[PDB]
Amino acid sequence: GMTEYKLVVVGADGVGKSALTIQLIQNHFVDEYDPTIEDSYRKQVVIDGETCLLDILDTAGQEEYSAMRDQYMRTGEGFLCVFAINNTKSFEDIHHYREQIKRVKDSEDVPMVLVGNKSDLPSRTVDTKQAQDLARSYGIPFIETSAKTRQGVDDAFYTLVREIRKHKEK
Ligand SMILES: C[C@H](Oc1ccnc(-c2noc([C@@]3(C)CCCc4sc(N)c(C#N)c43)n2)n1)[C@@H]1CCC[N@H+]1C
Ligand SMILES: Nc1nc2c(ncn2[C@@H]2O[C@H](COP(=O)(O)OP(=O)(O)O)[C@@H](O)[C@H]2O)c(=O)[nH]1
Ligand SMILES: [Mg+2]
């Protein structure tokens, strides 16, 4: 049967979670998508020759640590932790998102990719080296993306699928 991969996109308001998700789903840059909409979206894709079904949860809205929200996030098999390369605060938030993922998955080994979005913009404030080194501290991949130009979009989601596969095979 066709394997389905449940991917969750997390990170600060405004980093481009929805834009990245919609590039994957629609193959179009959407520069405006209601920042409060949290929803999931499926797409069939071929990854290393295997046709699979991606189910992407684009997170949004208020921070809340209820049993219900934990349960919803726990359905994710892998997580994209997204910051914007022109927003230092969004990068400094990453460790909090990673810590909450570890907690809800009750695992130190959750499939995860660090994503530096908005790579098309010249106003960089987070060095690539610092981001690469954070990914190295966590032992996870780092992908540079632009939802505007589609740079890195497949790389981010497909790498996360590969990380889920690796984890399932252990
Ligand atoms: C960086 C923070 O800000 C925000 C703002 C919005 N969201 C968060 C946030 N952290 O983790 C999560 C997710 C969605 C991630 C996946 C796993 C779980 S499990 C659960 N219950 C979740 C929730 N709500 C989450 N989201 N953090 C700073 C610093 C602390 C206070 N704050 C001002
Ligand atoms: N230049 C540029 N703008 C982006 C990119 N991704 C998102 N944006 C803009 O960043 C803002 C927030 O994007 P959005 O997808 O709503 O982020 P979310 O809150 O993380 O879902 C909007 O003004 C988008 O047009 C990108 O890669 N490049
Ligand atoms: Mg959004």
Residue numbers in the entry: 0 to 169
Can you list sentences taken from the study reporting this PDB entry?
KRAS mutations are among the most frequent gain-of-function alterations found in patients with cancer and their therapeutic targeting has long been a key objective in precision oncology. The KRAS GTPase cycles between an active (GTP-bound) and an inactive (GDP-bound) state. Here we report the discovery and characterization of a non-covalent inhibitor that binds preferentially and with high affinity to the inactive state of KRAS while sparing NRAS and HRAS. The pan-KRAS inhibitor works by preferentially targeting the inactive state of KRAS to prevent its reactivation by nucleotide exchange.
Extensive optimization led to BI-2865, a derivative with a prolinol substituent and a pyrimidine linker, which enabled a direct ionic interaction with E62, as well as a water-mediated hydrogen bond network with the side chain of R68 and the main chain carbonyl of Q61. We established high-resolution cocrystal structures (1.0–1.1 Å) of the pan-KRASi (BI-2865) in complex with several KRAS variants. These showed a conserved binding pocket across variants defined by the α2 and α3 helices, the distal portion of the β1 sheet and the distal portion of the Switch II motif in KRAS. A part of the KRASi pocket overlapped with that occupied by covalent G12C inhibitors, such as sotorasib and adagrasib, with the notable difference that the pan-KRASi engaged the pocket without relying on a covalent tether and did not extend in the P-loop channel near the G12 residue. By comparison, the affinity was 60–140 times lower for KRAS variants loaded with the GTP analogue GCP. Selectivity for the inactive state is probably conferred by the conformation of the Switch II motif (including residues Q61 and E62), which partly occupies the drug pocket in the active state conformation of KRAS. As a result, BI-2865 inhibited the proliferation of isogenic G12C, G12D or G12V mutant KRAS expressing BaF3 cells more potently than precursor 1 with a mean IC50 of roughly 140 nM. Last, the inhibitor attenuated tumour growth in mice bearing KRAS G12C, G12D, G12V and A146V mutant models, without causing apparent toxicity to the mice (at least as determined by monitoring animal weight).
